[PDB]
Amino acid sequence: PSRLRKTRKLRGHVSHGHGRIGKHRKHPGGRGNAGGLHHHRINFDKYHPGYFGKVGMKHYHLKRNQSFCPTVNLDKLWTLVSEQTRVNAAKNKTGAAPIIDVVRSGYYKVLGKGKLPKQPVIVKAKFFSRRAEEKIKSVGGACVLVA
Amino acid sequence: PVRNVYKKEKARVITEEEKNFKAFASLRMARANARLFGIRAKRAKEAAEQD
Amino acid sequence: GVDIRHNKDRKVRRKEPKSQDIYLRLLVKLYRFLARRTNSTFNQVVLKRLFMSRTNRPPLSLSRMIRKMKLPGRENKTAVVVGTITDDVRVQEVPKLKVCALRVTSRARSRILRAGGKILTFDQLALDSPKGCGTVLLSGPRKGREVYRHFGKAPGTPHSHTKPYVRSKGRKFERARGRRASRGYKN
Amino acid sequence: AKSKNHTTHNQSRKWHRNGIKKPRSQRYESLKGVDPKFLRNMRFAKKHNKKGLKKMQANNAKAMSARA
Amino acid sequence: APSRNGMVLKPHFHKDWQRRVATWFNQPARKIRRRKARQAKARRIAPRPASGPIRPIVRCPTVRYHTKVRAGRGFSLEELRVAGIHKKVARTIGISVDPRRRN
Amino acid sequence: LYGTWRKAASLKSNYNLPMHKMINTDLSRILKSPEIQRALRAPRKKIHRRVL
RNA sequence: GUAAGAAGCCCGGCUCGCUGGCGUGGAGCCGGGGUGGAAUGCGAGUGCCUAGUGGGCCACUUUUGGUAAGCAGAACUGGC
RNA sequence: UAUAGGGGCGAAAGACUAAUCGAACCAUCUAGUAGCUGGUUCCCUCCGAAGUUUCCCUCAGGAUAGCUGGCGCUCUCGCCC
RNA sequence: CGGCUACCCACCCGACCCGUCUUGAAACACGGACCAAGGAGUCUAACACGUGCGCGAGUCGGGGGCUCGCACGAAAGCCGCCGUGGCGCAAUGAAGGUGAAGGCCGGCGCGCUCGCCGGCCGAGGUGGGAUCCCGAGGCCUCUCCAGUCCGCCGAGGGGCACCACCGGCCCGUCUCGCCCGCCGCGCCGGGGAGGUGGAGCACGAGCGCACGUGUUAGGACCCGAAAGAUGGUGAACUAUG
RNA sequence: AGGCUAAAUACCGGCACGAGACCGAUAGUCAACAAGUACCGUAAGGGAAAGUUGAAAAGAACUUUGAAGAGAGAGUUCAA
Ligand SMILES: [Mg+2]
Ligand SMILES: [Mg+2]
Ligand SMILES: [Mg+2]
Ligand SMILES: [Mg+2]
Ligand SMILES: [Mg+2]
Ligand SMILES: [Mg+2]
Ligand SMILES: [Mg+2]
Ligand SMILES: [Mg+2]
Ligand SMILES: [Mg+2]
Ligand SMILES: [Mg+2]
Ligand SMILES: [Mg+2]
Ligand SMILES: [Mg+2]
Ligand SMILES: [Mg+2]
Ligand SMILES: [Mg+2]
Ligand SMILES: [Mg+2]
Ligand SMILES: [Mg+2]
Ligand SMILES: [Mg+2]
Ligand SMILES: [Mg+2]
Ligand SMILES: [Mg+2]
Ligand SMILES: [Mg+2]
Ligand SMILES: [Mg+2]
Ligand SMILES: [Mg+2]
Ligand SMILES: [Mg+2]
Ligand SMILES: [Mg+2]
Ligand SMILES: [Mg+2]
Ligand SMILES: [Mg+2]
Ligand SMILES: [Mg+2]
Ligand SMILES: [Mg+2]
Ligand SMILES: [Mg+2]
Ligand SMILES: [Mg+2]
Ligand SMILES: [Mg+2]
Ligand SMILES: [Mg+2]
Ligand SMILES: [Mg+2]
Ligand SMILES: [Mg+2]
Ligand SMILES: [Mg+2]
Ligand SMILES: [Mg+2]
Ligand SMILES: [Mg+2]
Ligand SMILES: [Mg+2]
Ligand SMILES: [Mg+2]
Ligand SMILES: [Mg+2]
Ligand SMILES: [Mg+2]
Ligand SMILES: [Mg+2]
């Protein structure tokens, strides 16, 4: 919207919002990231520290495809399966337990949080944190490794 | 041609000492065994070689 | 002139709500009338929070809206929120509590109606409590916004804990000079 | 092409344009910068206060409320 | 040139990008062309079904997508021999045949 | 094709009717209701103009 | 520069792996009791985004170099 | 008729090479770049400066701090303290 | 008769010709003879912040597909076993990798700067903190009695958001000591107490669209060079055979 | 270290075709018109200006001054 643009409002002022003394001409400092070490170090440092140098090993032909492991928390561990399932499976029937298979839900590694109630479940996954493993052992469930 | 298979296996009771046997340490033991498989074989070959 | 003091003519305030929502303007009219005709500072604060913006009305969560009622003294009071109350995927048990908010999400309304609670809007809140008796006025996590974690006196000079802007959080992006003592300096 | 080098004229006026501020608000002063042996005193004192203060302070509060 | 606290930007516009700007103004045009192509195929070619040959159940090679499943390319000659028909006879029946796919 | 607030749309997949911001929105009826006018100060209609 | 109070005084008790003749010292924690604590004026605190500026000059006074300058250079305040 | 541009030709002045020669002309790259001149288009209202710190092959410039504006938020007086 | 006014004239006072560079312009600083038309902060991508809307631990079809051949239809509508995918819900490490819940009660091993068994609570505490709750008390024309009535409050309590501090948890390193288990007892894994580094956790607030400002790269507010490269045209002037 | 092969893809040249929140004769292609035309340079090459009477010419018969250009009358037209 050029009618809401500032340019239509500044018609009449001589220097047009950029001063009579300073005279913004073309490029007074440089272009882009010019002078990262020489004369703009108080802006490259003090606003982006760490920008200059090498940091570690150089993994040639790295893919974001072998390290694929979406993590699931113990808060999210219940709601991968519906609440009707856990209620009608642990409504005082027997010592059975429903299986929450996170691989079908699309998650690989089960990590540990709070809020894991008394009703025990069996979790099938590829990786586990020992926090979540202790939480499942404390609530009385089981831990199954699949692949 | 998708046919997303639904293997349910829902109703089962928690069982015997597999629940006290399938702990976290199995993954770390398998990781250490995979990292130190061949070097132990080299040390066993050297133990058979050095008499 | 006359006044040797500096001129700060308009203080800070937003009187008219900048939103063009007709329903919000009707609620603004109703609670402005109640705020100037009831001497109820509850109606004063609810009128100011209706004047308040979209970002500064953060979404309440269902577990927080439970835990602020779980405190002793909030048995039959109604939780009033100027803002949205959303679902929480964490909790499993929901009490029989009463809600008075704007634009409660669908799963939250469904779980409150399954648990047996009563959701309202501000017109029924005004019909049930003009002075606002029996209400607990709640607010949400303003500082929990991701925008507020980039804000501080610096991004890195007394290490500052304040999250500099970068594309990809990982190796090779802003980790060498000023982030570790082996490459130059360390903050 | 010689220019003016350095001055502090029209500086205190710019300072007092915005009202020079004391930090003026530190209740429960910041604890970093204190002797680590004193920290090994105070943190262990705090966590054993969290552990073993219950029954003696409870009976003492009951006694002073009965005598008061 | 830089400013207050903002992200370091490196746009790839130093090369003469103004010549090669392919904007999809013919995107509904290609959509109507390809609709008429599929409809003309289904009319004039055969009472064979659209997307003619049958595709196999195929698992995706990764540690990422191997839980999922996919319509492959062809029926992997050992599989077609166990089914018991000739190769081009299968191709004319409507069986998609890939001689590369192992088992 | 759209539904009510009780059921979803049976033709569209995941659409519901939006929740209304005000349930009963007759502002004149609300301001003339006895529950509101029970809890008002007083109609103060004096002007109190400038005294020379 | 600092202080002119309720974030302050006073009393009673627990903890300490600090310290150590000593229930000695020192910090932390808990509970209780009393706000009328210099003058004048003022409603305050806080978060984000950003333009312009980055060539100055003059005057009372204190001053450096120069014989002096409508010369060059500093300090407080005011002005252009 | 032959020598055609960083080439020709010069009894040598860097002279001549189509009114242009210490590097011709025409077109393209090309709207080359410029911290450097000039200019920058309607009204009213409100607030309203700086020529200073530090750094830079920095001294006609820029970055940072300061001065400034805009957007709000948290509270408080409004009924012997 | 009245009449301000883009008509003219006179009179009194004030009044140097505009624009910019500049500390300073009416300047013996520069541009402007006059007039009409054209003429300078745009557009794309990216980012940040604020605002507005929809959905909200999710969000988005921008990529395709489906509708009968319709001017507006290059629109719009729908997909859901089209969510592949982008962003967010998890960070810390160079990496192998690891990866955020603790507290209380009772019994026991020497409650021993120490581990086990059963039950319970559950995102910890302190000081501030809008609002909210209980309520002493007194208040309505002449006698006790009452219910809403006119009508506030001493004092106390739970404490939103947010601020300060303490404490706890995760990851990488640092120091000190002890224990546990074996798909097989080893230069095997895991655990504990303190001190640090992190852009973390400590009940999550994001996604998409639009608008405003600012920055960056693109011709980038308009106009401006001495220069460099590529390919061709000239000895009809002149220089020389 | 020998070879063929349609599809989806690209198209600011060309042949016809349709539409436009675009410009409206100093704008839009250089060119709405005898436009790569007039014209310039030896040549490579450079390169314009220039639309509108009226509905229909019904474009003003005839008289008169002047050698004619040009007028004065008259006439056509809703209007010279
Ligand atoms: Mg101005
Ligand atoms: Mg500038
Ligand atoms: Mg005045
Ligand atoms: Mg200077
Ligand atoms: Mg700037
Ligand atoms: Mg280019
Ligand atoms: Mg600006
Ligand atoms: Mg300057
Ligand atoms: Mg001087
Ligand atoms: Mg001077
Ligand atoms: Mg003055
Ligand atoms: Mg050359
Ligand atoms: Mg010549
Ligand atoms: Mg030269
Ligand atoms: Mg040259
Ligand atoms: Mg230009
Ligand atoms: Mg002012
Ligand atoms: Mg230097
Ligand atoms: Mg300088
Ligand atoms: Mg200048
Ligand atoms: Mg600045
Ligand atoms: Mg301000
Ligand atoms: Mg100036
Ligand atoms: Mg000068
Ligand atoms: Mg002049
Ligand atoms: Mg002139
Ligand atoms: Mg004009
Ligand atoms: Mg926003
Ligand atoms: Mg996905
Ligand atoms: Mg140029
Ligand atoms: Mg060069
Ligand atoms: Mg050549
Ligand atoms: Mg000749
Ligand atoms: Mg000669
Ligand atoms: Mg071949
Ligand atoms: Mg070949
Ligand atoms: Mg092809
Ligand atoms: Mg015209
Ligand atoms: Mg033209
Ligand atoms: Mg005609
Ligand atoms: Mg005649
Ligand atoms: Mg007419």
Q: Give yes or no for a contact between B14 and A140, defined as CB atoms under 8 angstroms apart.
A: yes
Helices (H), F1-52: 27-31, 34-37
Among A47, C174, D3, smallest CA distance to E6 is for A47
The CA A26 to ligand 27 mean position distance, Å, reads 27
Question: How many Å from the N-terminal Cα to the C-terminal Cα in chain C?
Answer: 50
Tell me, yes or no, if A53 comes closer than 8 A to chain C by beta carbon. Answer: yes
Q: Does E53 touch chain B (CB under 8 A)?
A: no
* Rounded-to-integer distance, Cα B30 and Cα B18, Å: 17
Helix (H, G, I), strand (E, B) or coil at C72: coil
Q: Residue E9 in contact with residue A32, Cβ under 8 Å?
A: yes
**Residue of chain A with shortest Cα separation from C111:** A83
Strand G nucleotides, any atom under 7 Å to a protein CB: 2, 7, 12-19, 26-32, 43-58, 72-79
Query: Which of A32, A47, A65 shows the shortest C-beta gap to E1?
Result: A32
Here the tokens at position D1 are 């092409």
Q: State whether residue B40 is helix, strand or coil.
A: helix
- Bridge partners for C120 per DSSP: C100
Instruction: Residue A110: count other Cβ atoms within 10 Å of its Cβ.
Output: 26
The residues with which E95 forms a beta bridge, in sequence order, are E54
User: Which of A104, A108, A136, A138 is most worth mutating to test chain B (most B CB atoms within 10 A of its CB)?
Assistant: A104
Cβ-based interface (< 8 Å): residues of C facing E:
150, 155, 164-167
CA distance C92 to A83: 9
Nucleotide showing the shortest C1' distance to residue E18 CA: I218
Q: Is the distance from CB of C31 to CB of C50 less than 8 angstroms? A: yes
Q: How far is the CA of C180 from the C1' of H11 (A)?
A: 78
Single out the residue of A34, A15, A33, A35 nearest to residue A25, CA to CA: A15
**How many angstroms is the resolution?**
3.6
Q: Which residues of B touch A89 (CB under 8 A)?
A: 10-11
Question: In whole angstroms, what is the distance from residue C108 CA to residue C81 CA?
Answer: 14
Q: In the complex, which nucleotide's C1' lies nearest to the CA atom of residue D2?
A: H59
Strands E70-71 and A96-97: unpaired
> Which of C160, C165, C169, C177 is most worth mutating to test chain E (most E CB atoms within 10 A of its CB)?
C165
**CB-based contact C75:C47 (threshold 8 Å):** no
Chains F and E make contact, 3+ CB pairs within 8 Å: no
Ligand closest to CA C10:
22
Residue nearest to nucleotide G30 (CA to C1'): D57
The position carrying tokens 């015997």 is: B16
Q: Which residues touch strand J (CB under 7 A)?
A: E 19, 22, 30, 33-34, 37
Report strand pairing: E70-71 vs E57-58: antiparallel
Q: How many CB atoms lie within 10 A of CB B23?
A: 16
Which residue type sits at D4?
A: K
With a CB cutoff of 8 Å and minimum separation 6, the contacts of C66 are C91, C94, C95, C97
CB A107 within 8 A of CB A127: no
Tell me the C-alpha distance between A90 and C89, whole Å: 19
Interchain CB distance below 8 Å, B19 and A127? no
**C-alpha span between C84 and C49 (Å, rounded):** 12
Could you tell me the two tokens for B12?
Answer: 């089962």
Round to whole Å and give the CA distance between B37 and A76. Answer: 37
Q: Which residues of E touch B5 (CB under 8 A)?
A: 69
- Chain C hits for F27, CB-CB cut-off 8 Å, are 26, 29-30
Sort strands A99-101 and A122-125 into parallel, antiparallel or unpaired.
parallel
Taking CB atoms and an 8 Å limit, are A48 and C89 in contact across chains?
no
| I chain positions with any atom within 7 Å of a protein CB | 19-23, 41-43, 45-58, 63-67, 74-75, 78-81, 84-85, 88-92, 94-101, 103-105, 111, 122-123, 126-127, 130-133, 157-168, 170, 181-184, 187-191, 194-200, 203-206, 211-224
If you search the block for the tokens 């996170």, which residue do you land on? Answer: A102
Q: How far is A29 from chain E (nearest CA, A)?
A: 5
| Angstrom distance (rounded) from CA A100 to CA A77 | 8
End-to-end CA distance of chain B: 63
The CA distances from residue B27 to A99, A125, B22, C175, in Å, are: 21, 12, 9, 32
Interface contact E7-C150, CB threshold 8 A: no
In chain C, what residues touch A59 (CB-CB under 8 Å)?
A: none
Q: A46 to chain E: nearest residue by CA?
A: E5
Distance CA A12, CA A102 (A): 66
Is residue E98 within 8 Å of E74, Cβ to Cβ?
yes
Residue C68 CA to I147 C1' — how many Å? Answer: 37
- Tell me the CA–centroid distance for residue A14 and ligand 26, in Å: 22
Q: Which nucleotide is nearest to A13 (CA to C1')?
A: H40
- Give distance CA A76 / C1' I89 (Å): 10
Q: Are A146 and A99 in contact (CB under 8 A)?
A: no
Query: In terms of DSSP H, where are the helices of chain C?
Result: 22-37, 41-51, 62-67, 106-115, 122-128
In chain C, the residue whose alpha carbon lies closest to the alpha carbon of F34 is: C127
Residue A69: which of A31, A108, A37 has the closest Cα?
A: A108
Q: How many CB atoms lie within 10 A of CB A128?
A: 23
The CA distance from C42 to C82, in Å, is 12
Dist. CA C111 → ligand 40 center (Å)? 80
Phi and psi for E44 in degrees, rounded to 5?
Answer: -85, -30
Show the beta-strand stretches assigned E in E1-103.
57-58, 70-71
E7 touches strand G (CB under 7 A): no
C-alpha angle E85-E90-E93 in degrees, rounded to nearest 5: 120
How far apart CA E71 and CA B4 sit, in angstroms, is: 12
Q: How far is CA E67 from the centre of its chain?
A: 20
Element (H, E) at A101: strand A99-101
Q: How far apart are CA B8 and CA C121, in angstroms?
A: 43
A93 CA to J21 C1' distance (Å): 69
Ligand 2 (ion): residues with CB under 5 Å are: A 22, 28
Please give the Cα distance from C28 to A96 (Å, whole number).
55
D neighbours by CB contacts (3+ pairs under 8 Å): none
Beta-bridge partner residues of A72: A110
In a mutagenesis test of the E interface, which of B2, B4, B5, B6 is the best target, namely the one with the most E β-carbons within 10 Å?
Answer: B2
- Cα separation, C8 vs D16, in Å, equals 16
Dihedral sign for Cα E39, E40, E41, E43, please: positive
For residues C56 and C36, is the Cβ–Cβ distance under 8 A?
A: no
Instruction: Provide the 10 A C-beta neighbour count for residue A32.
Output: 16
Distance, in Å, from the CA atom of F32 to the CA atom of F37, rounded to the nearest integer, reads: 7
Amino acid (1-letter code) at residue A114: G
Burial A113-123 (b: 16+ CB within 10 A, else e): beebeebbbbb
The number of C-alpha atoms within 13 Å of C72 and in the hemisphere containing its C-beta is 0
